[PDB]
Amino acid sequence: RILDISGQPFDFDDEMQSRSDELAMVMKRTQEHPSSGVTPNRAAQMLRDAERGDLTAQADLAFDMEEKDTHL
Amino acid sequence: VVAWFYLNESQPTEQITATYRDTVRWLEQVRDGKTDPGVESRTAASPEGEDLVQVQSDPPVFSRKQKGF
Numbered sequence: 001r002i003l004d005i006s007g008q009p010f011d012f013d014d015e016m017q018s019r020s021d022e023l024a025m026v027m028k029r030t031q032e033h034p035s036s037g038v039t040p041n042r043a044a045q046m047l048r049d050a051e052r053g054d055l056t057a058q059a060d061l062a063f064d065m066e067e068k069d070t071h072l
Numbered sequence: 073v074v075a076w077f078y079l080n081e082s083q084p085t086e087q088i089t090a091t092y093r094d095t096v097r098w099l100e101q102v103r104d105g106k107t108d109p110g111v112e113s114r115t116a117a118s119p120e121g122e123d124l125v126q127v128q129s130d131p132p133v134f135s136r137k138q139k140g141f
Contacts, residue, residue, distance in 0.1 A: 037139045068141070 035064035 001009040018027055034046065034057055043061070050058035065072060077084065077092035084092075101107045111118050 031063070032060055033064055034061050035068060 002012045003009050017023065034042070046057040046061060073091055073095050077088055080088055098107070102109050109119070
């Protein structure tokens, strides 16, 4: 068994975690664009949700900002 | 009223002439849009009419309904 950096032994698997058949469904995603009609309340709600561990709407919003804004 | 005034052309009385004048004044007021002709009593329905006010312009790009930017 391969020893982890923390010192806890484990088993090494060469196959990716995303290659599992059950995980294949969640791999395909539709990239929504929440930057259409932005509202300060909407942005605040997205940030609040990302604080608790959502991390999805914030990621899509950041992707939209990095392409819509030329200076950024 | 106006037909009766038309018939009494040989000699019109004061009241007939006054009623005809009031009727034509009401008709001019209706034409100018200062008063509504009304609707039939059997059911609420006003006569159809053409568009008194009409404006024309090209399609409004960059409007707030775009929501694409």
